[PDB]
Amino acid sequence: PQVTLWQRPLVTIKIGGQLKEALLDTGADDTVLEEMSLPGRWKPKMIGGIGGFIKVRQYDQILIEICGHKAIGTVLVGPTPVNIIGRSLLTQIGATLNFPQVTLWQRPLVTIKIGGQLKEALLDTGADDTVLEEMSLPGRWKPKMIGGIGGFIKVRQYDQILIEICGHKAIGTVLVGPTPVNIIGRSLLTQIGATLNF
């Protein structure tokens, strides 16, 4: 199917004999599920995100059926606020991001121009809003807390900010704060006609 990004891109998955809902997340390298019962051995792992890091259990060779497609790979389990399907499984179901078409074997980075500056940012279907690392932006803003895989961060909310993303113009909200990576979220992805296809 093709999916636009006006809403969170959620899918139904079956793993370990259980049914769950998960977010197709182009900004995630790997799949991370909330605590659940999985069969077999696993290795202790630390992963980072917005908010910091979390400790997860790493299971390999885990069979997952994501929509009507089967895939085998690494599944991380731990204190994530939402189940996410990352790129290492997205590639297995043939998922692409279109706006150019882009496969997901590598992080989907784009060049953006904002506030007269050039930066690189990750097209992130798992992010509601756009979040950039500290930078100089003109004008007024509002304090705001946003949540992510490792907890919450305080950001500055700038509205009606012009961004040119891969040479497409869009105006929307941009959050600025201690994110580890610049991410372009759904509220700007919709404005450049981005879709997920698998």
Q: Which of 25, 60, 129, 159 is catalytic?
A: 25
What's the CA gap between 82 and 90, in Å, rounded? Answer: 17
Tell me the DSSP string of 4-37. Answer: ESSS--EEEEEETTEEEEEEE-TT-SSEEE-S--
Q: Which of 30, 60, 124, 129 is catalytic?
A: 124
Active site residue 124: yes
Half-sphere exposure of 112 (CA within 13 A, CB side): 28
Residue type, position 170, single letter: A
Cα–Cα distances (Å) from 168 to 15, 113, 148, in that order, read 39, 10, 27
- Residue among 1, 3, 7 nearest 187 (CA): 7
What's the CA gap between 77 and 34, in Å, rounded? Answer: 6
Active site residue 25: yes
* Enzyme catalytic residues: 25, 124
